[PDB]
PDB file of C-alpha atoms in Angstrom:
ATOM      1  CA  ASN G 171      22.968  -1.768   2.695  1.00  0.00           C
ATOM      2  CA  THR G 172      19.771  -3.612   3.588  1.00  0.00           C
ATOM      3  CA  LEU G 173      16.501  -5.014   2.269  1.00  0.00           C
ATOM      4  CA  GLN G 174      14.296  -3.873   5.160  1.00  0.00           C
ATOM      5  CA  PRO G 175      11.608  -1.358   4.125  1.00  0.00           C
ATOM      6  CA  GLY G 176      11.785   1.851   6.122  1.00  0.00           C
ATOM      7  CA  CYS G 177      15.398   1.477   7.264  1.00  0.00           C
ATOM      8  CA  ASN G 178      16.547   4.278   4.953  1.00  0.00           C
ATOM      9  CA  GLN G 179      14.109   6.775   6.468  1.00  0.00           C
ATOM     10  CA  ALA G 180      15.010   5.935  10.064  1.00  0.00           C
ATOM     11  CA  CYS G 181      18.753   5.931   9.468  1.00  0.00           C
ATOM     12  CA  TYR G 182      18.710   9.212   7.546  1.00  0.00           C
ATOM     13  CA  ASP G 183      16.602  10.864  10.234  1.00  0.00           C
ATOM     14  CA  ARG G 184      19.038   9.670  12.895  1.00  0.00           C
ATOM     15  CA  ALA G 185      22.136  10.764  10.970  1.00  0.00           C
ATOM     16  CA  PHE G 186      20.903  14.282  10.097  1.00  0.00           C
ATOM     17  CA  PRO G 187      18.226  15.426  12.562  1.00  0.00           C
ATOM     18  CA  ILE G 188      18.353  18.970  11.145  1.00  0.00           C
ATOM     19  CA  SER G 189      19.891  19.962   7.826  1.00  0.00           C
ATOM     20  CA  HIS G 190      22.758  22.444   7.925  1.00  0.00           C
ATOM     21  CA  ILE G 191      21.090  24.863   5.519  1.00  0.00           C
ATOM     22  CA  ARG G 192      17.982  25.353   7.658  1.00  0.00           C
ATOM     23  CA  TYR G 193      20.083  25.923  10.771  1.00  0.00           C
ATOM     24  CA  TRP G 194      22.098  28.576   8.938  1.00  0.00           C
ATOM     25  CA  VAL G 195      18.969  30.303   7.611  1.00  0.00           C
ATOM     26  CA  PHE G 196      17.514  30.450  11.113  1.00  0.00           C
ATOM     27  CA  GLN G 197      20.815  31.799  12.433  1.00  0.00           C
ATOM     28  CA  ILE G 198      20.960  34.544   9.803  1.00  0.00           C
ATOM     29  CA  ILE G 199      17.410  35.739  10.452  1.00  0.00           C
ATOM     30  CA  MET G 200      17.847  35.666  14.229  1.00  0.00           C
ATOM     31  CA  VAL G 201      21.129  37.579  14.076  1.00  0.00           C
ATOM     32  CA  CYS G 202      19.562  40.231  11.837  1.00  0.00           C
ATOM     33  CA  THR G 203      16.506  40.603  14.107  1.00  0.00           C
ATOM     34  CA  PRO G 204      17.921  43.178  16.599  1.00  0.00           C
ATOM     35  CA  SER G 205      18.796  45.622  13.818  1.00  0.00           C
ATOM     36  CA  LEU G 206      15.236  45.261  12.530  1.00  0.00           C
ATOM     37  CA  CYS G 207      13.923  46.021  16.015  1.00  0.00           C
ATOM     38  CA  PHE G 208      16.112  49.123  16.263  1.00  0.00           C
ATOM     39  CA  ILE G 209      15.057  50.393  12.828  1.00  0.00           C
ATOM     40  CA  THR G 210      11.374  49.841  13.583  1.00  0.00           C
ATOM     41  CA  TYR G 211      11.738  51.661  16.910  1.00  0.00           C
ATOM     42  CA  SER G 212      13.438  54.567  15.143  1.00  0.00           C
ATOM     43  CA  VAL G 213      10.587  54.732  12.623  1.00  0.00           C
ATOM     44  CA  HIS G 214       8.019  54.679  15.431  1.00  0.00           C
ATOM     45  CA  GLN G 215       9.840  57.446  17.308  1.00  0.00           C
ATOM     46  CA  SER G 216       9.470  59.907  14.415  1.00  0.00           C
ATOM     47  CA  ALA G 217       5.868  60.529  13.353  1.00  0.00           C
TER      48      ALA G 217
ATOM     49  CA  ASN M 113      18.414  -9.774   4.645  1.00  0.00           C
ATOM     50  CA  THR M 114      21.115  -7.870   2.773  1.00  0.00           C
ATOM     51  CA  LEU M 115      22.089  -6.312  -0.547  1.00  0.00           C
ATOM     52  CA  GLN M 116      25.692  -7.553  -0.645  1.00  0.00           C
ATOM     53  CA  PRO M 117      26.413  -9.924  -3.556  1.00  0.00           C
ATOM     54  CA  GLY M 118      27.794 -13.254  -2.405  1.00  0.00           C
ATOM     55  CA  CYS M 119      26.527 -13.053   1.179  1.00  0.00           C
ATOM     56  CA  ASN M 120      23.907 -15.741   0.531  1.00  0.00           C
ATOM     57  CA  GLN M 121      26.518 -18.246  -0.648  1.00  0.00           C
ATOM     58  CA  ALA M 122      28.858 -17.649   2.287  1.00  0.00           C
ATOM     59  CA  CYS M 123      26.120 -17.727   4.908  1.00  0.00           C
ATOM     60  CA  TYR M 124      24.518 -20.883   3.517  1.00  0.00           C
ATOM     61  CA  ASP M 125      27.886 -22.626   3.359  1.00  0.00           C
ATOM     62  CA  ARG M 126      28.582 -21.676   6.974  1.00  0.00           C
ATOM     63  CA  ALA M 127      25.139 -22.745   8.201  1.00  0.00           C
ATOM     64  CA  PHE M 128      25.079 -26.164   6.480  1.00  0.00           C
ATOM     65  CA  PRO M 129      28.624 -27.379   5.764  1.00  0.00           C
ATOM     66  CA  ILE M 130      27.309 -30.830   4.796  1.00  0.00           C
ATOM     67  CA  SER M 131      23.708 -31.665   3.958  1.00  0.00           C
ATOM     68  CA  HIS M 132      21.980 -34.240   6.144  1.00  0.00           C
ATOM     69  CA  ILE M 133      21.020 -36.459   3.213  1.00  0.00           C
ATOM     70  CA  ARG M 134      24.606 -36.950   2.033  1.00  0.00           C
ATOM     71  CA  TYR M 135      25.744 -37.813   5.553  1.00  0.00           C
ATOM     72  CA  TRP M 136      22.986 -40.410   5.867  1.00  0.00           C
ATOM     73  CA  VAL M 137      23.778 -41.947   2.469  1.00  0.00           C
ATOM     74  CA  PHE M 138      27.440 -42.262   3.417  1.00  0.00           C
ATOM     75  CA  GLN M 139      26.458 -43.797   6.753  1.00  0.00           C
ATOM     76  CA  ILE M 140      24.198 -46.375   5.104  1.00  0.00           C
ATOM     77  CA  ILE M 141      26.832 -47.496   2.603  1.00  0.00           C
ATOM     78  CA  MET M 142      29.569 -47.671   5.236  1.00  0.00           C
ATOM     79  CA  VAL M 143      27.382 -49.671   7.620  1.00  0.00           C
ATOM     80  CA  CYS M 144      26.508 -52.133   4.852  1.00  0.00           C
ATOM     81  CA  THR M 145      30.159 -52.557   3.793  1.00  0.00           C
ATOM     82  CA  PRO M 146      31.194 -55.327   6.265  1.00  0.00           C
ATOM     83  CA  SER M 147      28.382 -57.611   5.105  1.00  0.00           C
ATOM     84  CA  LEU M 148      29.622 -57.088   1.549  1.00  0.00           C
ATOM     85  CA  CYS M 149      33.127 -58.043   2.677  1.00  0.00           C
ATOM     86  CA  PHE M 150      31.810 -61.228   4.277  1.00  0.00           C
ATOM     87  CA  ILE M 151      29.701 -62.195   1.253  1.00  0.00           C
ATOM     88  CA  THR M 152      32.572 -61.622  -1.171  1.00  0.00           C
ATOM     89  CA  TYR M 153      34.910 -63.656   1.041  1.00  0.00           C
ATOM     90  CA  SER M 154      32.381 -66.496   1.111  1.00  0.00           C
ATOM     91  CA  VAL M 155      32.113 -66.393  -2.687  1.00  0.00           C
ATOM     92  CA  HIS M 156      35.903 -66.448  -3.020  1.00  0.00           C
ATOM     93  CA  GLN M 157      36.213 -69.383  -0.618  1.00  0.00           C
ATOM     94  CA  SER M 158      34.076 -71.653  -2.821  1.00  0.00           C
ATOM     95  CA  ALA M 159      35.356 -72.065  -6.380  1.00  0.00           C
TER      96      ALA M 159
END
């Protein structure tokens, strides 16, 4: 509720520094990483 | 600096309850009144 240009951008950036969806995507990939490491090590071990 | 309807009216009314010009007009008439009283009394006294 204002007429000042640029207030919307600043206030939105302050309210939501990082969106939930991106945080959850990062979390999913990071949590799945160790299994990927184990599988790749297993592949390397054989042949 | 706002988007709220009716904020301009309220804020202007609070800032300037009475305009200067109206106050000065009232002052001028009131200050001139006693001379009018005296002149009318003088007219009444004669004839």
